[PDB]
């Protein structure tokens, strides 16, 4: 994998 | 009678052939001498056919010349690839760091452009957290450069973009020190979104290059950050495109009064270079309708610009954008006919409850935004193959215009050692570069500059300094002229060369037939 | 009479002077008359004289001009500076420090390259462990590239060679994701083991530039292993040739129906660079033999090709190195004629006793292909600058010829910080480049892309890639066109203006000089 | 009577209106000949008007063209952007390290250049530890590069400036190693101390490129020691040039017989990279005064340089700047006229007694030799945009020059990993680098590079070094050749078109009205 | 800061 | 030293 902001 | 004007004619006749015919007192001398005349005449038919088929095809004669007229220095326009500020960008890190949620992140800033890019970012995070997965090339898009410069003020923009104070360490030019607020003209770049333009300024601080112009520039990012993981940063990177994340200056050297076009043509110099651009001044002059096709002044726009072919293709191509998707390209200039077409890239549309919630609607609006951006781009790709609607558009090169051809090279231009050691004492001690940025405004930016740019870690800080070395290689102007091949006045010796060799006619030879014929008709 | 005949003559006569000499009454008028008439010929004479020798100079007229049709978008070719890939690189590295003997390790792997290559190596390592201080030079240039491109098959370094898969990243061309398995075509040179040629494909993956080509390639060589002592590794190194040992991309534009030549044309880009390639195209038009000198067609080669002068020129040196050395030179193209020429580097005569010994014998041989090594070079060398050799190969430029003039320009490519982390995301979380060597067959290359492009390193890894950006600057063509400067028609005009201005002839007056002297043969 | 001689007049003329107008019977007939023969006869003096506008203007015609007549081998000119040479400035540096006085450090050197250096660094120290804060600009102009050069004799810089042997680590030309003492000539130039210029040899060490030149060249400056603390090191830095403080090499492509300008024209090649100049050469042609204007010979020089434009134009630069200043400006040629003139920088007038204080003497002094160079400085920079003064230097472009277009690339020459192994081994194993400077002249050289260049540290050591890769991209000639446009053969072509075609007339026809005017100041 | 020679 | 494959 989730890529965050 | 008939033999009696017959006679008249030919005893006072200066045609060369039918005294011949006339006064013929055998058949077959007549005959000979007639069939001399008819073909002499067919003959001259057929070379007045070649010679008229010349003149009507309307040749250009074409000259190339060196010349010593001198061309005013070229303007000269920077664009720092990197479009924002890197306080703002360490900024908007750490924010994000703190709290991945743009939404409680809206007021947490006094900054205006904060405000609204987290705005504009909160109005697509939910989709965000949701749909990685299934359509990571649409958030990729949509996060771009363009967004974001489409749909916030660019006065606003401004203000967090890069600095003229923070750009420019110095300049030189004609031997003198640059006036940065009288010399540079700053201008807006959807993809570059601070740029500025160099106008030449002539001698009334005596230093620097005496032939042309010399500037430092701050261009490097290693003062960012260094995350230990992979954080998308929207508005950063332009998904995909030639120049996505590219480190350095663009640099376009055009005619003085111009507006740059930085996507499309310039050149590139990395950080830590030194690149001399010697440039070799060109001067086009051609003709009108008749023999050629040139003009004066865009079809599209006004006159306060002076006319490049540059601009009126990218006019055409934004015009057929506009028909076709209904919006227009930001990529492109915005015609000066009608400003009421929105960009292919508003979003102003988006309901609130975005922030909120991923509901399908919010989904079904953002790909419509990605069906807009698509079509924009199709449209952009085919448009310039088309040979029927760019010849519609009336885009003709200009009438009279200044070229330069540059010969590019590169430098390393902090050399290691005691050189460098002098460089960073210009920059640092005499300049006092740092001390530019110690205002209440840009405090935060003092601290970063502070510490990066210490004595310690010069040899690697400076490698994110780069310099141009702009200069006229040649002082005479390499000049291309066309002008008419075949000239009226060309036409009328050819005509009377080839009168005279076959038949031996003149003009008043005419009043003489016209004469006989006067006599004809009053007997008849 | 005489006379009679004279006055009618006279009397009927459209010539402007023998009137007056034939009538005239007195000896100094017509002694003035003759001078006159005499004069006015000579003069006349003169003056056709300079015409002539104008007219059969066969003069040319040449035009220099900016039109709007479009030329296609040129091929482009993208030969890796790194001959082999770099797993099989490193397998040889390791397969020697653990054994240094090439003839124990031909068993050791079932790649067939590596058995071919390590046979070939086995075939003078006795040599090489006898003779590094007596010749070290001789060594030198036996383990070049060349060496093992003209001895071992093609179809077999192809499995070695730098793969189209591992090697183009990412392409974009015309807005529109490339497909590399139809758009990329595969040609081999003895130098640069693999290269790869881009024909364009225009729109019938809505991403990328627009306007132009644009591609991320993996050049560099830093995930090599880095030994702690000198090592030689053949098949690596060209022994000082301007080419030796430089990393990066040779990049070449040509017209996309043509071989291109990447040892003697085209660019340099260095890896950790983005490099924009702004054409602007070019057309020249000139005119066959009785003007000029141009051809349609290569006189060496056969017709599947478009002509270009470099073909040609190289097709005549490598006839003439035929000629002289008696062999080929890999480094030439090999002419369409006869193909049992082999290439001065072949050495399968070598005896199998060479792997056991270092005989005299084996030594021999060795001088013996370093002497012909040494022919084909000095042949090369000297050739060009023979012009009696050179011009005995027709040789002519075309009659039709397209050409690009190239803006060349580097920026950073992997910018540090967050676009830098952008990239990479794009790289390897979208594209996922390291996904494409998970396959069985390439199992090896996946452990060390993985280990070498982690997360942690990657502002030193990603200095590896290069990405091309090709695009067309100008849409107009700066077309170049020859054309005959004194046509017939002009000579003729010419000719007409002299005879009227001089003698006041017409073809029709020599009728009557013609009617004259058949009178005149007539009374005798 | 008058009658008479007019009725035979128009009985034997050949002239076509005239014979109407005498013989006509008819008034009204008489008025319409007449009108036609008046009109006939001022259109054709307005059609000759147009004639001799376009004779008497004296157009060029050119022809631009490929041919295959080869040029010679250009010559290359190459200059290190450090002055001094390593060991040299290393010895400085740590001399002033232990006593940063120079006066006491004038005796500790047996090297001449490094006494006069302390000599004329002492002539300057005292003003510099008091004034810095006052005028830091002026004393980092007064120890510019450019000062010592006008100070020091060019004989005693010479034995401490970039040596021929420890610059050019290999060269290979046309297949063969360059000789470097026969090949390469070196000149003094004031900014890059030593330059050397390469000239080519045809051969009669059978290696390296066959088709043009390389060489290896050392050029960064890594091995310089790293001050903790910013140190001035005067004669280093050329304060706040366009070439303050680069790092790499400066070539020059120009024609082989002519003097090198490296400040004002060339490429960059920054250490560690490897370019490709890919030369095509082009060939100028052009007419003397009456339709263009061209010389063969400088107006201000001898006749031992060939011709180029450059050459006139700064000697007519420096002719002007020494009657202004009346001073020679060191950047520069010297005038052969005049060599009494002493160069704007000259500072010999200063006493010994600054050596030991800082009276205002000695800063009046200072004050002086700055305002001096403001002057050369200003007239530098404006001298050449007054096209009044420019033009009575007469300085023409040369009638038959060569050009050489150069396509300019980099690639990164010491790869990372086994080829960078091999080009380490080929610098130091084979060619023994090193050995050349373990003499004992340079014993301190030795070890110096013997530390630096080690086997552990080769991927960033060899950093340092550079290749250069020149050669002919194309063997064709682009030939640009004018001529005169308007012969006096086409002008009596279209005289006599134009006289045929209106009136009728030939040149013995005048001979008519010449027998008749004569024959009327008879009758009269 | 004072720069020395 | 003696150079080895
Ligand atoms: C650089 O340019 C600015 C703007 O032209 C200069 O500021 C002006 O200076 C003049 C006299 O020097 C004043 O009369 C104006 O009122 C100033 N402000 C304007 C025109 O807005 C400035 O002096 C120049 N030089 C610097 C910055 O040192
Ligand atoms: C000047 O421009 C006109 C208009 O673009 C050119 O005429 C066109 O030529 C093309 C190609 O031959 C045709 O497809 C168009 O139909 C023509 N237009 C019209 C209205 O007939 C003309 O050839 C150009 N001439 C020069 C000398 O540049
Ligand atoms: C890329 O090109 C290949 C080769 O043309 C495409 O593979 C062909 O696709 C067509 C229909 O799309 C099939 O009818 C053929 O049988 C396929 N194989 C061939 C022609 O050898 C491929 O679809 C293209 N796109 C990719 C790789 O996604
Ligand atoms: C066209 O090519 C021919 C043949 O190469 C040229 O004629 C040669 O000219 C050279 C130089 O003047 C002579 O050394 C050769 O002997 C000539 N060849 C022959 C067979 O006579 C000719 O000059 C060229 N013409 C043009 C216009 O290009
Ligand atoms: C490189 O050039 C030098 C200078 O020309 C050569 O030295 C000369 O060699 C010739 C015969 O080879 C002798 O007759 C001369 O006495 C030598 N010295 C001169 C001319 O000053 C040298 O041999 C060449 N090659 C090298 C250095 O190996
Ligand atoms: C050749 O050079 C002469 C002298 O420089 C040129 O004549 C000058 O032309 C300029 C611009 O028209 C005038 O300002 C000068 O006064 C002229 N000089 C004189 C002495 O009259 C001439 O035009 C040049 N011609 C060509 C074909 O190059
Ligand atoms: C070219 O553009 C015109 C615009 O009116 C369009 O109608 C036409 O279909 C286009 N042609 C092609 C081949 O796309
Ligand atoms: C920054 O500005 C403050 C005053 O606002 C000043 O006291 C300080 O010395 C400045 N920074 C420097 C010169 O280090
Ligand atoms: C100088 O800055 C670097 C970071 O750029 C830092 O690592 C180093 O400690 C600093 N040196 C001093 C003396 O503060
Ligand atoms: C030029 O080439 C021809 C090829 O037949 C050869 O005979 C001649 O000797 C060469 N000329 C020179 C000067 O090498
Ligand atoms: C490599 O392929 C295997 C299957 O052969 C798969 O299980 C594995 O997850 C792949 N590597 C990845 C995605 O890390
Ligand atoms: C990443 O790779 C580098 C070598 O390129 C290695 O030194 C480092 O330990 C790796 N990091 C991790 C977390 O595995
Ligand atoms: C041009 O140079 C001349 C040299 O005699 C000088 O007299 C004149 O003032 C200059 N013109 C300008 C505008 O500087
Ligand atoms: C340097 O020269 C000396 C002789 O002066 C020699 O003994 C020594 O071996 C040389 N250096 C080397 C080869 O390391
Ligand atoms: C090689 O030289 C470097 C400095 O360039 C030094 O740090 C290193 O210790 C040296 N290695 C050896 C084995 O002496």
Same mark, same amino acid.
């Given at each position: ?5 | ?366 790909? &419509? @935004?990605?069906?807009? #951006? ?8 085919? /448009?310039?193959?088309? =040979?029927? !609607? ?99 006045? &060309? @036409?009328?010796?050819? #005509? ?8 031996? /006619?003149?003009?008043? =030879?005419? !009043? ?13």
């Amino acid at each position: 994998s989730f890529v965050r902001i | 009678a008939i033999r009696d004007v017959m006679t008249k004619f030919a005893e006072q006749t200066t045609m060369h052939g039918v005294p011949k015919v006339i006064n013929a007192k055998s058949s077959m001398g007549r005959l000979f001498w007639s069939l001399v005349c008819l073909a002499a005449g067919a003959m001259f038919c057929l070379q007045m056919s070649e010679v008229l088929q010349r003149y009507f095809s309307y040749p250009k004669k074409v000259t190339v010349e060196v010349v010593p007229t001198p061309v005013p220095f070229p303007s000269i326009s920077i664009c720092n690839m990197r479009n924002l500020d890197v306080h703002i960008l360490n900024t908007l890190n750490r924010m994000f760091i703190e709290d991945d949620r743009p939404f409680s992140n809206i007021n947490k800033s006094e900054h205006e452009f904060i405000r609204a890019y987290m705005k504009k970012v909160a109005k697509y995070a939910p989709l965000f957290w949701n749909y990685q997965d299934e359509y990571p090339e649409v958030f990729q898009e949509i996060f771009s450069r363009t967004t974001f410069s489409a749909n916030i003020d660019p006065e606003v923009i401004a203000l967090a973009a890069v600095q003229l104070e923070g750009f420019v360490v110095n300049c030189h030019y004609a031997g003198h020190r640059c006036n940065k607020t009288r010399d540079f003209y700053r201008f807006f770049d959807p993809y570059y979104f601070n740029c500025f333009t160099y106008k030449a300024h002539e001698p009334t601080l005596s230093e620097g290059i005496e032939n042309g112009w010399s500037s430092i520039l701050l261009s490097g990012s290693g003062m960012l950050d260094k995350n230990d993981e992979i954080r998308m940063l929207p508005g950063l990177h332009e998904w995909r495109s030639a120049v996505s994340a590219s480190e350095g200056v663009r640099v376009v050297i055009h005619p003085p009064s111009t507006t740059p076009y930085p996507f499309t043509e310039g050149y590139d110099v990395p950080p830590g270079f030194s690149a001399s651009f010697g440039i070799h001044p060109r001067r086009n002059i051609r003709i009108g309708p008749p023999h050629g096709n040139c003009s004066d002044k865009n079809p599209f726009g006004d006159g306060t610009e002076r006319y490049r072919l540059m601009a009126c293709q990218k006019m055409c191509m934004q015009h057929y954008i506009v028909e076709t998707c209904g919006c227009a390209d930001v990529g492109l200039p915005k015609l000066p006919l009608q400003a009421n077409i929105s960009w292919c890239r508003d979003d102003d549309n988006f309901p609130d409850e975005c922030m909120f919630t991923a509901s399908e609607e919010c989904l079904q609006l953002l790909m &419509q @935004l990605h069906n807009r #951006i698509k079509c924009a781009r199709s449209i952009k790709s085919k /448009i310039t193959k088309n =040979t029927t !609607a760019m010849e519609a558009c009336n885009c003709f090169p200009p009438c009279d215009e200044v070229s330069y051809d540059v010969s590019y090279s590169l430098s390393k231009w902090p050399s290691a050692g005691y050189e460098g050691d002098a460089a960073y004492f210009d920059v640092f001690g005499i300049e006092k570069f740092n001390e530019r940025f110690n205002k209440t405004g840009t405090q935060g930016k003092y601290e970063l500059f502070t510490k990066y740019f210490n004595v310690s870690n010069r040899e690697e800080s400076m490698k994110d300094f780069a310099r141009l070395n702009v200069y006229i290689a040649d002082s005479n102007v390499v000049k291309t002229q066309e002008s008419e091949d075949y000239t009226r006045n &060309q @036409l009328v010796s050819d #005509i009377g060369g080839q009168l005279g060799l076959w038949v031996g /006619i003149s003009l008043i =030879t005419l !009043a003489e037939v016209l004469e006989l014929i006067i006599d004809l008709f009053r007997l008849f």
